[PDB]
Design brief:
The complex is a heteropentamer. Chain A has no helices and 19 strands. Chain A is mainly β. Classes of the chains: A mainly beta, B mainly beta, C mainly beta, D mainly beta, E mainly beta. The structure holds 2-acetamido-2-deoxy-beta-D-glucopyranose. 2-acetamido-2-deoxy-beta-D-glucopyranose binds next to helix 1 of chain C.
Chain lengths: ~220, ~220, ~190, ~210, ~210
């Protein structure tokens, strides 16, 4: 059971230099070729290149030839994917795939690395309540939620009752606004008879901005 | 570059039924006289890295259930899921490793074909807290519907709205295999308080006629 | 019936690259898990096949090619490569389906030695998987050589120094090349 | 006997193309390793390319992707095609017979490749009159480009004491040359001295007569 | 890329002595070294291959030694000529590299230069430029100083020097100092002098001429 572990998420401004890592562990690893796959948001998988750690033989895809540099360090069993100058077109999630040969399928995959290149700066989210009312009830069930707006970068974790309320929750994927910031909405369906008995609070956490907001939603 | 093309782009198969995905190769995917096609299938669940299911068009990775089957020869290949289960919802890719330029397929989205369920539609006026900031957001919620195809149109005083709405869709639910959609109508507070009626119109297969949720400022 | 992999890899001495040994392996169950998952290999490059899934496949025949070369020349044991060894001593086809295994052998094959040879002169490149053991004097001119070294007449074989004081690139490297055959004849080399 | 004669060198603008030939005798070209070695003016020797007996070709990094080495068995000649030429490539290129990609046991006479945006110009020869036992005189070869220029005295009759100095690049971008001889006094007047200057790149041949003024 | 360092950068000895040249490498090459001799105006000639094996026709007085990183070329009974730029080349790891060279020059008795000065020719003066040439013929050692004094004013920045190699007959160097002036500047001065300092001269020797005389 060979495993590949990549580096953490990267957020960089355009024009910077980035170097992400991919370390593998496993007895049968001298045979394993390490490649790189790019997956742009909402799109398919794109193969960038491959390197054999033993002799650092690197074969690049023509679409990525010269655009990126693939390196290796057999001493620490790590592979690298480095950009000289980052462009906003490089906002994508990058996987490293391991295969026990060239022209063989890639069996071992890493967890992935998220690279968000943008000219925007870190900004805390603004949390507003979606009040449950006669316009938000289905007779026996009432729909309420929280609106998370104008934050950067990803991700934002939203929980209800500090993780206690989980059934019937829906946290929508973040949408990128033209302002360069993200917006997100999370809603929960709860019985309409509990609008007074229970207190519904959404917990929005933005680790990059250290923004912890606990907004109480009430009719 | 050997262009890999898949069909269909999206597939809806009911639970326990057979799912078939095709993959068309521009060239041959043979590496030598082995007569073995150097073609593989990958499964990627949402938020998950790709997982190799079938390689050499016939051999399955260790641990892959028997319901997955691969077949084909030459330039035509097919991936078959004999009995679809709730855990088979993912995006499936076909990748060739014959030539050095490795090429993946466009990707096929596989969803569980459940019964038609009408959406539950709710509308939310902007909060007073947000109103202080100078921008007003009106959110329309489409909850627990199938299929995913749904039309949302914003009308303000019976005037269609364009360029100030963004939609977001959740993935298929594990339990009910439904979808949830949220359309957000963003406006400045100056323009928000120039009108009265904010209506959200929803069209779906599960609706005999379009429903409209509205409120007065 | 265990496949004699240990005879090839763990051989007391290896053959020179110009006269590389080939071991034909048939009618045995092959346990490659003894081979890989064992470290001590500085280079384990596989082409077209995966050693991980080698224990559940059936091949008609398996070939194990053994020779000793310098570390600098290990890269020449690869499809599409060119050099003194890839052209005149040992050539791999561009569609090579197998693994190339090498490891440093400065302890064993280096003597403070002068026994491992390679072909230095040849009029044409080697076809894939071709063995040439000719010691005939190479004729570099129009004058026939009559089997005696001299002007425009060179011995086609040269010997590696293989001194332990040399650099890593000059150190001897035992190389074993695994070639897998899948003829229509009934398969005789399988695994567990 | 082994002969290696080279040709094809000369002035070429940067970014141009140049091809040099190396006629070979005394051995078969198709059966031997052949290499091109260049020597920058006043610098060391640099290996450029090699062609194996089996036809394999290998190039140095500084010329990889720009230089191509080839042979013609039917003409027993080794070729070196120099494309995408640069000013830094300006050097004297030698044709050497390689022994198994190890060392060069026979070398060609060498031909100079000059890569500059300058234009060829013919030389001007001026007499150097002797001053009023032993007397000295010479000729001044000034403002020519590119190298080289060959000088002779009395069509090769006078060869003793003929000192031809190395050319020096002047501030104008053109080379200058002086060649002098040391003829004993009282030989002036009885013997007439003429210096034969040849500049093959400009196809200039001047036989200027130097007389004691 | 293995780099070869040669010491000394230049060595001078009298005929009949023994010259020792050292070639040190960045990394061990295991006796895969070659030695060459390159006389001025000639191609490199193979001397010793394998760091110990003399080539065909090489006299026994040449000898090679050493292995690994340190190498030594020893030449005994130094005759006339036999002095050139000697290069060591390694062929242990690609790419093959040469040494920077070790120039060799013979020694002889200290000989004073024969100083001659040449006024510019009238033909050249018609072109608008004047060239004054000072000759230092058949001197040893090579080190010499030439200064141009015009009307007892030292001239700098408008003169160039060129020196030949050792003469075959008597191992004597020769230097030419050339002064470049426009025609107008040449007419504005009367006396042009050339002052020479050398080991073979007790006092600086000055040769001068007056314009129009
Ligand atoms: C060779 O000996 C080693 C120990 O030095 C052993 O682990 C290995 O299994 C042997 N080789 C093979 C091919 O079995």
């Amino acid at each position: 059971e060979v495993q590949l572990v990549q580096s953490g998420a990267e957020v960089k401004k355009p024009g910077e230099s980035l170097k992400i890592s991919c370390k593998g562990s496993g007895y049968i690893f001298i045979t394993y070729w390490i490649g790189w796959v790019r997956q742009m948001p909402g799109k398919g998988l794109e193969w960038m290149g491959i390197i054999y750690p033993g002799d650092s033989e690197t074969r690049y895809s023509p679409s990525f030839q010269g655009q990126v540099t693939i390196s290796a360090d057999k001493s620490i069993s790590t592979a690298y994917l480095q950009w000289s100058s980052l462009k906003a077109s490089d906002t994508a999630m990058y996987y490293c795939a391991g295969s026990s040969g060239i022209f063989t399928p890639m069996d071992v995959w890493g967890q992935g690395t998220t690279v968000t290149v943008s000219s925007a700066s870190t900004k805390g989210p603004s949390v507003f309540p979606l009040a449950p009312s006669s316009k938000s009830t289905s007779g026996g069930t009432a729909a309420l939620g929280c609106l998370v707006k104008d934050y950067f970068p990803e991700p934002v974790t939203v929980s209800w009752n500090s993780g206690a309320l989980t059934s019937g929750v829906h946290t929508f994927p973040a949408v990128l606004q033209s302002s360069g910031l993200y917006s997100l909405s999370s809603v929960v369906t709860v019985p309409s008879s509990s609008l007074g008995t229970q207190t519904y609070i959404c917990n929005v956490n933005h680790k990059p901005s250290n923004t912890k907001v606990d907004k109480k939603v009430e009719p | 570059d050997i262009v890999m093309t898949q069909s269909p782009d999206s597939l809806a198969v009911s639970l326990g039924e057979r799912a078939t995905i095709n993959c068309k190769s521009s060239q041959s995917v043979l590496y030598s006289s082995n007569n073995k096609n150097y073609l593989a299938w990958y499964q990627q669940k949402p938020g998950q890295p790709p997982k190799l299911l079938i390689y050499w068009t016939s051999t399955r990775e260790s641990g892959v259930p028997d319901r997955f089957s691969g077949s084909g020869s030459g330039t035509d290949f097919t991936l078959t899921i004999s009995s679809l289960q709730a855990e088979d919802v993912a995006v499936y890719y076909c990748q060739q490793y014959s030539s050095t330029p490795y090429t993946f397929g466009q990707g096929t989205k596989l969803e569980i074909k459940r019964t038609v369920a009408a959406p539950s539609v709710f509308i939310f006026p902007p909060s007073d807290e947000q109103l202080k900031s100078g921008t007003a957001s009106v959110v329309c919620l489409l909850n627990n519907f199938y299929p995913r195809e749904a039309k949302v149109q914003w009308k303000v005083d019976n005037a269609l709205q364009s360029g100030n709405s963004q939609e977001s869709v959740t993935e298929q639910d594990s339990k009910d295999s439904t979808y949830s959609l949220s359309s957000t109508l963003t406006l400045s507070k100056a323009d928000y308080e120039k009108h009265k009626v904010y209506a959200c119109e929803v069209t779906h297969q599960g609706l005999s006629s379009p429903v409209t949720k509205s409120f007065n400022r | 019936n265990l496949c004699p992999f240990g005879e090839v890899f763990n051989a007391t001495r290896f053959a020179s690259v110009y006269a590389w040994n080939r071991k034909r392996i048939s009618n045995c169950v092959a346990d490659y898990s003894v081979l890989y998952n064992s470290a001590s290999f500085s280079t384990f490059k596989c082409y077209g096949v995966s050693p991980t899934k080698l224990n559940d496949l059936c091949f008609t025949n398996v070939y194990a090619d053994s020779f000793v070369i310098r570390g600098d020349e290990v890269r020449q044991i690869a499809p599409g490569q060119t050099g003194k060894i890839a052209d005149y001593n040992y050539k791999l086809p561009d569609d090579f389906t197998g693994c190339v295994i090498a490891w440093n052998s400065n302890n064993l094959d280096s003597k403070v030695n002068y026994n491992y040879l390679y072909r230095l002169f040849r009029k044409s490149n080697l076809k894939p998987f071709e063995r040439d053991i000719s010691t005939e004097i190479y004729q570099a001119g129009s004058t026939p050589c009559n089997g005696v070294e001299g002007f425009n007449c060179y011995f086609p074989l040269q010997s590696y120094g293989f001194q332990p004081t040399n650099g890593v690139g000059y150190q001897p490297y035992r190389v074993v090349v695994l070639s897998f055959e899948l003829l229509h004849a009934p398969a005789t080399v399988c695994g567990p």
